[PDB]
């Protein structure tokens with residue numbers, strides 16, 4: 001049995017898509033060892049079902065994402081040095097056990113792990129967790145074609161400056177983040193396999209352009225559109241609440257695993273959802289409850305809402321009661337919603353979320369965007385009415401369903417992503 005090592009960047013939007021790919025590979029008979037930091041493992045609550053081996057390495061910085069943002073340039077470099085040393089030591093240990101590791105799939109944000117793989121005699125696969133269109137922008141930043149602070153780039157829609165990946169939002173971490181994004185392509189010619197969590201039909205032209213430079217493998221959605229979650233997802237509570245809701249009546253709301261809204265912005269969102277008279281399921285992370293309005297969680301949301309610190313997002317987006325998804329437009333949420341046929345209300349915050357919202361609204365045509373003044377309740381209510389009631393909203397739903405069907409083709413036999421995972425799997429045999 002071929003033994004695959006997997007090393008995501010320590011954040012849920014990087015762990016989860018690689019985990020789903022690992023589950024697909026394990027179903028084809030590969031042994032998987034998933035390398036997590038101690039900080040990630042502390043939140044891991046369920047993994048006996050997975051049958052994947054989990055091996056921990058130290059965080060490598062003081063006690064992990066929240067330490068990192070205090071000083072991105074320094075602490076990302078300390079994380080890098082520690083991870084290079086600790087993954088080397090772990091691989092040395094795994095080389096004393098059968099089956100021996102053959103390949104290391106690592107997050108594309110850590111391109112320097114390629115040199116660890118090759119030094120240890122492993123193949124290296126860089127796993128890109130953002131779409132081809134956004135990754136192309138990072139390639140152009142590495143080339144100096146573009147510097148991030150109307151924009152035409154090959155095979156991308158014309159973009160406003162607001163649609164470029166947002167790094168100014170990180171203030172003093174701005175420059176450090178821009179260099180890290182561009183670094184994803186710093187050794188691409190030396191990578192053994194280039195894996196993208198997308199499917200061809202979603203971005204035909206830029207995928208074709210990319211494939212003219214390097215052999216790339218589109219293998220997405222990796223999510224299985226359970227063994228599906230590592231972290232606490234409150235599945236029973238969420239799914240029983242959804243099961244009491246009628247078709248097309250629920251606004252699912254989530255800003256992902258990282259982004260945080262100000263107390264004032266949360267007030268705007270809370271009131272927009274109440275004045276809307278729709279049922280809503282709003283993921284508010286535990287460390288972000290306290291910025292909700294006074295009696296919001298315990299009383300005023302009780303009639304129409306479920307406010308929860310984490311949900312089983314794949315199961316929620318697959319539920320017929322969900323009519324639309326108010327999202328920060330992180331790539332996993334965008335692709336999971338698209339593959340589930342769920343139209344979106346885009347409220348992007350930073351990095352690739354800005355560009356994803358543009359693709360959602362103007363290319364794939366499965367969502368509407370809010371306009372800032374902060375984003376006010378009336379703006380949110382207006383977007384909800386657009387999606388939930390208006391004729392335009394029915395068009396967005398039909399478009400989302402057409403993409404769901406194309407994504408279903410891509411991952412089924414003979415589809416582009418199924419074939420590419422097969423090709424990857426065969427190359428290892």
Ligand SMILES: C[C@]12CC[C@H](O)C[C@H]1CC[C@@H]1[C@@H]2CC[C@]2(C)[C@@H](c3ccc(=O)oc3)C[C@H]3O[C@]132
Pocket residue numbers: 009011065066068069072108109110170173177180181184258259351
């Ligand atoms: C700045 C920050 C946002 C605020 C929040 O409290 C956390 C902040 C620190 C971590 C930061 C995060 C923004 C997204 C990242 C840059 C992302 C990443 C890393 C390397 C790369 O190549 O591509 C993308 C994953 C995570 O490293 C991020």
Ligand SMILES: O=c1ccn([C@@H]2O[C@H](COP(=O)(O)OP(=O)(O)O)[C@@H](O)[C@H]2O)c(=O)[nH]1
Pocket residue numbers: 011012013014016017233254255256257258259283309310311312313314329330331332333334336
């Ligand atoms: O209540 C939630 C909210 C999010 N997710 C998952 O967390 C990931 C969020 O990734 P994304 O790229 O959308 O945004 P990020 O957190 O990286 O900003 C996705 O895998 C979601 O499926 C989840 O399982 N439950």
